[PDB]
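Sample 3 of the quickstart, ligand nickel (II) ion:
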Amino acid sequence: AQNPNCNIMIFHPTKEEFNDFDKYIAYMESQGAHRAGLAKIIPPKEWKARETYDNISEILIATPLQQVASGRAGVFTQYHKKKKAMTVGEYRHLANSKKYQTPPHQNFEDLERKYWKNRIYNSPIYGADISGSLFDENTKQWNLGHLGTIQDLLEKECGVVIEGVNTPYLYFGMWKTTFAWHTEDMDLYSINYLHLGEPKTWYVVPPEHGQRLERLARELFPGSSRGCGAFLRHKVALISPTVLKENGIPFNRITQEAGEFMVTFPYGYHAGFNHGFNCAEAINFATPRWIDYGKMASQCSCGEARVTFSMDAFVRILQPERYDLWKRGQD
Ligand SMILES: O=C(O)CNC(=O)C(=O)O
Ligand SMILES: [Mg+2]
Ligand code: NI
Ligand SMILES: [Zn+2]
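Result:
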C-alpha cells in the first residue's frame, strides 16, 4: 500500500507530464497521494497562469465577509457578517492597513503560533466565492476554467445526463482570514491555485480517518451537533492543531505559496488561514474514483448549508433515498 502514513506528497511534473490533467491525478493516486487528503503540485518552470496580475484591481467583491469568532482560541466558530461592496484595489489597501496587516514575524512557524494564539480577537474580511477566473484563455495546461465538468464525468461513468454547470471561484484573503473544517460538496475533489500574494496554510485529516474528526467535532460543538447530523457542512467550526494532537486526531499541515496548486481528495477534511493579502482560484472536480464517495457523502438537511444549483442533480442521481429530505432543507 503506497503512502501508508498518509503524508502530504509534493509533485514536480515536467511540462510533458502537465499536458494531461486526468492522467496526472491518476498518477499521483498511484503513488498514494490521496491517502493524505491533500497534495501540492509545483508547476514546471516553463508554465505560467497568465502574463501579469497588473490589471486586477477592478474586480468587484460584491459581498465581502467579516469573519467574527466565538469560543476559545483553539476551539471556535466563525460567522460571516456581510459588508458593503468593494473593489480588489480597495480590499488590498484594507488588507495592508495597520488594523489588518500581517504582524512582524520570524518565519511561517512563528506566524502560525500567532494565528492560533490571536485569531479570535480580530475579525478579518474575506472576499470569498466570487465566480470568475484569472487564467489566461491561452493557458492550455491546468487551466481551472477549462477542466472536464463533473456532469460530464457522471455521464461518462454512469450514463446519465444531467443539468448543471461547474465554474471556478476567486478568493481574496488577508491576514487571519480563515477556512473552517470541511470536505467538499458531495465529497468532491478540489483544486486550488494561489495566483498571487502571501501564503495559505492548510491542515488536513486523511480520508480514512475523517470520522475521527467528526466525532471530536460533535464533542466540541455539542449544540451544533444536536441541530444537524452534518453540521461541518455549515463550514463554521475551527479546531487548532494543538487540540487535534491532544485528542489523538491524525492530521498533517503544509503551507502553499504563490504559483503552487493544491489538490484536496474526496472526503479529505481541511481547514486553514491566509498569511496576508492574496488571491486564489479554486474549483471542484471529479474522477471515476469519486463516484463511490459521492454516493456515501453526508448531507446537511437542516437548512443551514444551502448550496449550488448543480448539487441537486448529484443528490438526485447518487442519493435518491436522501433526495426528498435534502431538498426540503434547500427549500
Ligand atoms: O482557499 C480557501 O479559502 C478555501 N479553499 C478550499 O477549501 C479549497 O480549495 O477546497
Ligand atoms: Mg481589473
Ligand atoms: Ni475546500
Ligand atoms: Zn445543517
